[PDB]
Ligand binder design. Structure first.
Ligand SMILES: Nc1nc2c(ncn2[C@@H]2O[C@H](COP(=O)(O)OP(=O)(O)O)[C@@H](O)[C@H]2O)c(=O)[nH]1
Ligand SMILES: Nc1nc2c(ncn2[C@@H]2O[C@H](COP(=O)(O)OP(=O)(O)O)[C@@H](O)[C@H]2O)c(=O)[nH]1
Ligand SMILES: CC(C)(COP(=O)(O)O)[C@@H](O)C(=O)NCCC(=O)O
Ligand SMILES: CC(C)(COP(=O)(O)O)[C@@H](O)C(=O)NCCC(=O)O
Ligand code: NA
Ligand code: NA
Lengths: 307, 307
């Protein structure tokens, strides 16, 4: 019964490593690992290395495709130092570990042979600032599709992929819970752009960033596990981020375990869960690769689109 | 101000013909032309021939892409007599001329060098039959997304693209206004499948045929012109299709010009216009190529996705 997809387990997947080199040390992996994430070198080797191989294979093939169009159009040819940027989306729930997957992927790709320039941008820079969300009644919907300046986000990625020298994204601060005035992330004709955020795989009545992706990941897990990870990270942040007096959620620093669980579950119930179910999970069917994690953050299963 | 698209006029577009051969005679073009359509050899040469070139370029590049995935997976390689089928979508309003564009494209592609097997399937075979539409209260919504068995349609295209030997689509009769019992269109590992229908470029919370397209056309025109074409074809069918006593709309055969205009405008107003505005036109942004026709059915402008 034919399928666009093929499923693997970790055994099956890790065999596809071939002889892709491991270019990353244990200390280097630490700088990449997010609070609460469990990634080790073994996981890098068995899961991320075949991924990086898949992508290397696709970057070459995908260039052919733009080149055929440029040929058709009777066009100059290509700068071989500036190919069309390969755009990689990374999607999934809050707390599922997207930021680790993306940082690790970036680090692996930047260590391929020619040392490609590999940029990583998070869509939280494209959230409306609080004063605008407040205007729109959206202060309790950060991460919902409507809380983003989608036009700006699409402009940004179109600019990069169309080969602009320079493009700027705004910058969000979790600690201050708002866009940072005057802050910009500048992307300068990278070879590869990884775009990471809850809703990057969305589709709609207009052309969207997902329509520009040459590859996408969705980082998945059971909803109950993701909630547990969220609540557990909320409790852990009492003595990390929330302990900063400047932190927007500094008042949570002093909560007891049981108060903190209450608070975190209410945020999950009223914001992150509804967003996952209504907006994020309906984008999973389109991902080129789903990385499914077990309750321990271990990626044990994968679903690859072959069509 | 960068753009996924590039616009042409007919001058600009026709220069991209290069020396693509014209393999089609005036008599052959007649068999392809729909009631009310204006296509001539000149239009074939200036518009359809560069299109066919673009596609030839893309079929080769696109194969590379599946081959890279097959390589990654350590897979046999490919039957060179059975490559992965290249899937072409053709979308747009009722009465806009999709069936002519698709028949002409099929005829041009089947006349490339190796004589590729080029199948053409219309999504009207995937409409629910009347008894089922009646059950669902949809007898006045034929052509709306919900009037189709989308699961069956997706099964069909997945099967073909995944390399099945044989796949069957049901068959709709306009004359009898219903799916034809026991009729099947059998598609046998074509090299190219053209899938034509109002809503083929739709996207949604599940993987859809548009997610399987290697190329798509949208046949566009101003809404007022399309309505004029629709009403004018309705009046012309009084002495063609509706004149058949078996015809479902045989009672319209005897209408005066002015009665027929009334009838046809009401159908446009209550079915086809709402469908165009709510469902079809929101898919235009995704088409690889928009063919924009002037009031005379003349394709005078084109919009190509380069990203
Ligand atoms: N300072 C601070 N950082 C947070 C908070 N919530 C999430 N983060 C960080 O924001 C980044 C994105 O987190 P999240 O949106 O849950 O996406 P994830 O990467 O898939 O877990 C991660 O580095 C989190 O550690 C918060 O409340 N305060
Ligand atoms: N017999 C008959 N054929 C029709 C009728 N309406 C449309 N057709 C034919 O059905 C095919 C599809 O028409 P339409 O859905 O308008 O799509 P188009 O190909 O873009 O014009 C065309 O060949 C039309 O000639 C009808 O009421 N009766
Ligand atoms: C910033 C986020 C919306 C994620 O943004 P992303 O980069 O995935 O677009 C999420 O990490 C977040 O901080 N949500 C806050 C929910 C609340 O208002 O408490
Ligand atoms: C059959 C159609 C819905 C087009 O089908 P398609 O192949 O575009 O999916 C349209 O040609 C049609 O016949 N509409 C009928 C509207 C009515 O019920 O009178
Ligand atoms: Na996590
Ligand atoms: Na027409």
């Amino acid at each position: 019964e034919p399928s666009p997809y093929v499923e693997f387990d970790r055994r099956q997947w890790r065999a596809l490593r071939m002889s892709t080199p491991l270019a990353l040390t244990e200390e280097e992996l630490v700088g990449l690992r997010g609070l609460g994430e469990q990634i080790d070198l073994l996981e890098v080797e068995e899961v991320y290395l075949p991924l990086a191989r898949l992508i290397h294979l696709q970057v070459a093939a995908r260039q052919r495709l733009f080149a055929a169009t440029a040929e058709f159009l009777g066009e100059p040819q290509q700068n071989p130092d500036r190919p069309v940027p390969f755009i990689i989306g990374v999607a999934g729930s809050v707390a599922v570990g997207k930021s680790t997957t993306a940082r690790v992927l970036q680090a692996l790709l930047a260590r391929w042979d020619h040392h490609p320039r590999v940029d990583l941008v998070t869509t939280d820079g494209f959230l409306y600032p609080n004063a605008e969300l407040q205007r729109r009644n959206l202060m309790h919907r950060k991460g919902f599709p409507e809380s983003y300046n989608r036009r700006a986000l699409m402009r940004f990625v179109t600019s990069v992929k169309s080969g602009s020298d320079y493009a700027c994204a705004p910058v969000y601060s979790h600690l201050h819970y708002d866009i940072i005035p005057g802050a910009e992330q500048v992307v300068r004709h990278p070879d590869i752009l990884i775009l990471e955020g809850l809703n990057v795989l969305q589709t709609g009545p207009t052309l969207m960033v997902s329509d520009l992706f040459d590859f996408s990941l969705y980082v998945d897990a059971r909803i109950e596990d993701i909630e547990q990870w969220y609540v557990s990270r909320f409790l852990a942040m009492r003595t990390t981020a929330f302990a900063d007096p400047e932190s927007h959620f500094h008042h949570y620093a002093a909560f007891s375990d049981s108060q903190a669980v209450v608070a975190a579950r209410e945020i999950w119930r009223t914001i992150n869960r509804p967003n996952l179910v209504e907006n994020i999970l309906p984008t999973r069917p389109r991902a080129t690769l789903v990385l499914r994690k077990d309750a321990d953050h271990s990626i044990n299963r994968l679903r690859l689109r072959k069509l």
